[PDB]
Amino acid sequence: YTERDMLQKAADETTLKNVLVMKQAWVPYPAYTDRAAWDSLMGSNKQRLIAAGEKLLDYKWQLIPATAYLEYERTGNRKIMEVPYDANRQALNTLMLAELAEGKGRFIDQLLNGAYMSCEMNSWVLSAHLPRQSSKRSLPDFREQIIDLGSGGYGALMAWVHYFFRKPFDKINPVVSLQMRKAIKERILDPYMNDDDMWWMAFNWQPGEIINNWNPWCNSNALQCFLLMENNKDRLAKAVYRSMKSVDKFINFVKSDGACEEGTSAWGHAAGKLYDYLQILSDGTGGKISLLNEPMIRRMGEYMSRSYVGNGWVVNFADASAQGGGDPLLIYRFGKAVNSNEMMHFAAYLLNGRKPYATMGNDAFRSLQSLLCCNDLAKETPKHDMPDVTWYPETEFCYMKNKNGMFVAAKGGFNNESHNHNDVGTFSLYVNTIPVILDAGVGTYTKQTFGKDRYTIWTMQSNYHNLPMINGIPQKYGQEYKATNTTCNEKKRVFSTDIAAAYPSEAKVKNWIRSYTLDDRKLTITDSYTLEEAVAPNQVNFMTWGNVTFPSQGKIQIEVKGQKVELDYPTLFKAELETIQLDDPRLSNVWGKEIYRITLKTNEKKETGNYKFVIQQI
Amino acid sequence: TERDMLQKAADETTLKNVLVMKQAWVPYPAYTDRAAWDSLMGSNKQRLIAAGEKLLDYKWQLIPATAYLEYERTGNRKIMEVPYDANRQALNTLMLAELAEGKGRFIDQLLNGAYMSCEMNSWVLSAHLPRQSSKRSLPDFREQIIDLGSGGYGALMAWVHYFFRKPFDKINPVVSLQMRKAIKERILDPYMNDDDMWWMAFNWQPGEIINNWNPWCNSNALQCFLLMENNKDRLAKAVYRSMKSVDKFINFVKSDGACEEGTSAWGHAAGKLYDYLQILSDGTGGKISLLNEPMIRRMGEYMSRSYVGNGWVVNFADASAQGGGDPLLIYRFGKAVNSNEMMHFAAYLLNGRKPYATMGNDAFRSLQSLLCCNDLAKETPKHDMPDVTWYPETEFCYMKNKNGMFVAAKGGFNNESHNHNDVGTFSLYVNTIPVILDAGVIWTMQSNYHNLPMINGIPQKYGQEYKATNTTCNEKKRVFSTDIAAAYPSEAKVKNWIRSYTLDDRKLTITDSYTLEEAVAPNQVNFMTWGNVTFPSQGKIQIEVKGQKVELDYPTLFKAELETIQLDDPRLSNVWGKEIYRITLKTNEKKETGNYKFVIQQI
Ligand SMILES: CC(=O)N[C@@H]1[C@@H](O[C@@H]2O[C@H](C(=O)O)[C@@H](O[C@@H]3O[C@H](CO)[C@@H](O)[C@H](O)[C@H]3NC(C)=O)[C@H](O)[C@H]2O)[C@H](O)[C@@H](CO)O[C@H]1O
Ligand SMILES: CC(=O)N[C@@H]1[C@@H](O[C@@H]2O[C@H](C(=O)O)[C@@H](O[C@@H]3O[C@H](CO)[C@@H](O)[C@H](O)[C@H]3NC(C)=O)[C@H](O)[C@H]2O)[C@H](O)[C@@H](CO)O[C@H]1O
Ligand SMILES: [Zn+2]
Ligand SMILES: [Zn+2]
C-alpha cells in the first residue's frame, strides 16, 4: 500500500465544484427524440437491438419470492434468487437499447413496467450480499439499504432509464418517474452518502484488509447515479469527492507496475472498472479531472494484452484459470482513452474476425459506451504485437517471447500473494500459444481451499509447479517465504531469482538460484544451489499434458495440440511420468481428462551443485 | 330515517369499557392446538390440505403497471383483477390448509404471499384507484385509499399475521413487521385520517348513494383494528367511527328488510351488515349486538322469501332470474338472529350435498364457515314460509298457494336502484318455473317488456315521481292492488289505473280498472313468457314450459299475437335459452272508462 492519492492530488472539493457539468450536459448520447443522430450512431446495431427488444414485448417481469432469498441461508443457493433478478435486469437493459434504436414508443410500456416493478422490490441487493446489513439476514429489510455489486448496477440502469425516458413515461403517468427518483435516492444516493462503513468503500481500511474490484465497480455505479440524478451542485460535489477518496484507496493498494496479481479473469471488473470510473469522472468534469493520461493506468490496461498468450490461453499464476479472454469493445475503449495503440490493435485481434456489435448484458454504461466505439473498432487492424520482454518489477512477473513462437512466463514473489499458490520461481512455457510446461490453475472450492490445509490441495503446492523439492522438501506457505535478488535482463531475456527463502528450515538450503534464458530457439532452465546440509536427494518436477515420450536417457518429448518439444535433462536423474486423472470439471474443462507430472529423481546428495535443462521445438 | 341504532347502543366511553383486548375475542383455536383444530375441522381437514397441496408451487403473480393503466386506456378491469384475485385466493387457501394440517408445510408459501403483498404499492383495484387525489388508475405511493378489494386484502393479511406471526418470526421477524406497517398504512391510518371516502357516508346528503360498500368496507376495517390495534383509546375511537358510519347505512335502508337490488346483492349488502354486527358483537363480548333487532332478521329473511326454488328467484329491476346464495352464510346469519326459517332454508339450499368450508378470498367468511359446518350438516332441509310476504315501504309483495303458484308483484317508482320501468308488474311461477316472467339483466328496462299495460298506447316514463299510489296488500285474501296511473306521462291522459292480483287456491286473477281523461289510442296489454306458447281459441293462451302447463284467459275484444325475442346477449340466453316471447294484446276499441280481467290457472 502506497499513499499516491492521485485523485485527491488532481482536485479537491472546491476544484471539483468549479468543473462539474450540471444538468446532464455531459451525456455523450443523442436526445431520445433525435432520430437521425441515433440512426447514425447505431449503424447496423439498430436492426439487431430492435429485434432483441421485439423478443421482450411479452416478457413477464419475474417476482423474487422471499423463499428465494431465504434459500441463501438455508443451503447457500444464490442462483435461485440471481437468475430471475438478472433476467429482469437484462430485459430492462435490452429494452432501453431497443427503444433508443427505434424511437417509436413501442418498448415504452415494457420499460415502464420494468421500472415500476423495480421500485416495488424492497431492495436491489443480492441475497448473498444482504447479510452485510445490520440484521445480518439474507432477506431484504425494508427499513435499511446497503449497496453491493448488483444494486449499484441496478441503480445505474434505472438512472439511465429515467434519463432517457422520463418525458414519455411522464406523458403516461408522472408517478413512475417520481418513484424511480425516490428509489434511486433511497437505495444508492443516501446510503452512499450516509454510511461510511460499507466494506468496499475502504474508508476504514488498514493493513491486512482487502480492497478489490468491488471498490471501483461500486464507486463507478454510484458516480453514474449521482451524475444522472443529483441536480444540487453542492450535494453532487460532495458525493463525487467522496468517490474520489474511496477510489484512491484502490489505486493506492494495487501495484504501480500494473500487473493484476489475481490474473486476467478479474481484469475486466478490476482495472476495467477503474477505467470506467475514470471515464465517468472525466465526462462529468468536462475532461478537467482525468487520470487517463497517467502511465500507471496505461500499464494496468496493457496487462490484459501482455498476459494473453493466444487462442484463449492466458498466464495463470495463483488460483486462476489457464483459459481466459476479454471484452474487445471494453479493451478498445480503455486503449483509446489511455492512448495505447497496443491495446486497440489487441481488441481488434480478440474480435476473432467478428464485426463489433453493442454489448448486451445488464451493464448500462458499457452497453451505451459500446455504441460509441463500434465504428472505430470495426476499422481497427487486428494485431497482437508486444515487446519480447515485459518485466513487472514489484509484482515480480516476467514475460519473455521469441519470434519462433515460444512464450515463457516466470515469477519471483512470496507465498502470501492474492489467491496464492506456493510457486516462487516457477515458469510456464507456451509454444505457438499452446501450454507445454503448464500451470494447472484453479479447481472447485472445497472446505480445505481456505485455511490451514489449503496446501494439502495438489494445485496449490510447489510439488505440482515447475520447481525443485530441495532436499526433498517443498515450499511453505507464508509472507516471509519469498524470492530474493530477483532480476530480469530485458535485452538478454534472462530472468533469475534466489528461491531459497521460500523453503522451510527443514529444507536446509542457503541459496538456490533458478534462472530462465530464452534465446531465439530454446529455453534454458538452470538451478545453482548451496545447502546447509545434504539430507535427502533433490527432486525437480515439470507439469505437462498431451503425448509424452522418453526416446532416450536425458530426453523427453512432448507433443500437444500440433506442437512438439524436446526437454533435455541431466542424466543423473531418473525420469518418471505421473498421470493426474482430472475428476474436477473446473480443471478437466481446461485440460481434458488428465495431465502429467514429470518427476526427476536421483540418488545423488551433495551440498552444492547445479542442473541445466533445455527445451526446444522439434 | 335517523334510527342511529349503534350510537344508541353505546358511545365511545361505554364502548371502551366493553371492548375485548389482546384479541381474546377470537373464536378459533390457537394454531398450535392440533386436537382442537381436528375437532373443529372434521371432514374439511383432508379437503383443505389437498387444496393447499395444489398451491405448494403456486407462483405469486406480479401485477404490471400496464394492467392498471389499461383501466384508463380501455376500461378493462379484469386484466388487473384476475391475477390480484388469484393471489388473494391462494393466500386464503394456504391459511386454511395450514390451520388444517399444522405441520408447517404451507408456511413458506404463506410467508411468500405476505411478503409479495407488502411489496405491492397498493391493494386497491385499478377501477377504484381513480378516487385517489390524483384521480389516476395506478397506485401512487404517496397516498392510500380503501376500496372493496383493499379492505378484504387487509383483513386477510391481518388474519395471516394473527395466526402465523410466531412461525413467521422464527424464519425472519421482518416479514411480520412489514405486515404491521402495511396494514397500518393501507387500512388503519387512512380509515382514521380520511373522512372523505365516499362509502363511509360521513357528510352524506339526500340524492347520494349508500350501498353495500359501507358495511363491507366497515366490516373489513373493523377486523383489522380488532386484530392489529392494541392501544385501547385508539381502538375505541376506530370502532366508534365504524359504528357511526354503519349507522348511515342502517338509516338509509328500508325497515321492511327488502333488498331492492335482489338476491344477488343480498350476500354483500345485508350479508355484510350481518358480518359487521357479528364482528362487533364478538369484539365487545356480546355486549354491543343488534343481532336481536327485528329489522336485521327481516333483512336476513328476504333471502328466503325471494327464493322461489330450483335456482329461480324474484328478479325485479336489473337482476337475474337465476340466483342463489351461500348456504353457510345464510345458516350463520339465521342462527345469529334466531331465524329457524333461514337455518332450515340453508340446509335446503345444500340440495343433499355436505357443507364444506367456504374458499374464495374472504378470510372472515372462510374461518366462520369452519365454525358452523358441523351444525349445518345436522340441520334438516326445508323451505317453509308464509303464503304472503308484504314489504310495504319497498312495495314488494309475494303470494303463494298450496298448488305451487307463486306470484311476485310490486308498486314502487321509476327511479329505484338498477331501475326497470315496472311499476305494478308481476311475475308468476308454477312449481318454481317462471311462466309469466321478468326478463332481468335497453328493451329489458322498458314497461313495454314487463307485465303491464300501455295506457292509451303509451308506456311508463323514467323518474322519481313516476310512481304507484295507494299500494295495498290484503294478506289474508292474497290481494295486491295499486294505482299505476302516475307512472305514465301526461299524454297517457289517465286519471286512474288500478292493477290488482288475486291469488286463490286454483287461479291468479289479474284486473285492470281505468278512467282516462280522454280516449286517444287503444290500450295495449303485454305479458312476457317462454317455452311452448299456443293459442287454442279466442280468449285463450296456453303455455307449456319445463313440465308446467297453464292457460291465460283474456278478454275477447283483444287480438293476441306472439312476438319472438331472440336473445343474443349471453347473460340472458344463459338463463332463458335462445328466445323468449312477448304476448301482445291489442284492440280497436277505445273508451274513457273500462276494465279487463285475465285469469291464469294450471290445466
Ligand atoms: C458472498 C460474498 O460476499 N462474497 C465476497 C466476495 O465477493 C464476490 O466477488 C465475486 C467477484 O467479483 O468475482 C462476485 O462475482 C461476480 O458477481 C456479479 C454480480 O452478480 C456478476 O456480474 C459477475 O459475473 C460475477 N463474477 C464471477 C462469478 O466471476 C460475487 O458476486 C461476490 O459475492 C469478495 O470478493 C470477497 C472479498 O474478500 O469477500 C467475499 O466474502
Ligand atoms: C368502478 C366503480 O367505482 N363502480 C361503482 C360501483 O362499485 C362496484 O360495485 C360492485 C358491486 O358491489 O357489485 C363491485 O362488484 C363486486 O366486486 C367485488 C370486489 O372485487 C367482488 O368480490 C364481487 O364478487 C363483485 N360483484 C359482482 C361482480 O357482481 C365492483 O367491484 C365495484 O366497482 C358502485 O356500487 C356504484 C354505486 O353507485 O358506483 C360505481 O361507480
Ligand atoms: Zn499454480
Ligand atoms: Zn324487469
Residue numbers in the entry:
A (entry chain A): 18 to 635
B (entry chain B): 19 to 459, 474 to 635
What does the paper say about this structure?
In bacteria, however, a different strategy employing a class of enzyme known as polysaccharide lyases (PL) is deployed. PLs selectively target glycans composed of uronic acids with a C4 hydroxyl group linked to the preceding sugar in the glycan chain. This enables PLs to operate through a β-elimination mechanism that relies on proton abstraction from the C5 carbon of the uronic acid sugar ring, resulting in double bond formation between C4 and C5 and elimination of the preceding sugar. The three characterized PL33_1 enzymes were all from Bacteroides species inhabiting the human colon: BT4410 (BtPL33HA) and BcellWH2_04512 (BcPL33HA) are hyaluronidases from Bacteroides thetaiotaomicron VPI-5482 (B. theta) and Bacteroides cellulosilyticus WH2 (B. cell), respectively, while HMPREF1181_01744 (BsPL33Heparosan) is a heparosanase from Bacteroides stercoris CC31F (B. stercoris). The enzymes are 68% identical and contain a larger N-terminal α-helical (α/α)6 toroid domain (residues 21 to 401; BtPL33HA numbering used throughout this section unless specified) and a smaller β-sheet C-terminal domain (residues 402 to 635).
This enabled the structural characterization of a catalytically compromised variant (Y291A) of BtPL33HA in complex with a HA tetrasaccharide. The C-terminal domain possesses an extended loop region between β-strands 5 and 6 (Leu455-Leu484: BtPL33HA, and Ile464-Leu493: BcPL33HA), forming an octahedral Zn2+ coordination site [supported by anomalous X-ray diffraction data], along with the loop region between α-helices 12 and 13 from the N-terminal domain. The Zn2+ coordination site is a conserved feature in PL33. A hydrophobic platform composed of W224, W239, L174, and W242 underpins binding at the +2, +1, and −1 subsites, while no obvious interactions occur with the −2 sugar. The +1 subsite, the site of catalysis, is where the majority of interactions occur. The side chain of R103 interacts with the O2 and O3 of the +1 GlcA, while H154 only interacts with O2. N238 interacts with the carboxylate of the +1 GlcA through its amide group, while Y291 lies ~6 Å from C5. To determine whether conformational change accompanies ligand binding, we performed a SAXS experiment with the inactive BtPL33HA Y291A mutant in the presence of a HA tetrasaccharide (this mutant displays residual activity on HA but cannot cleave tetrasaccharides).
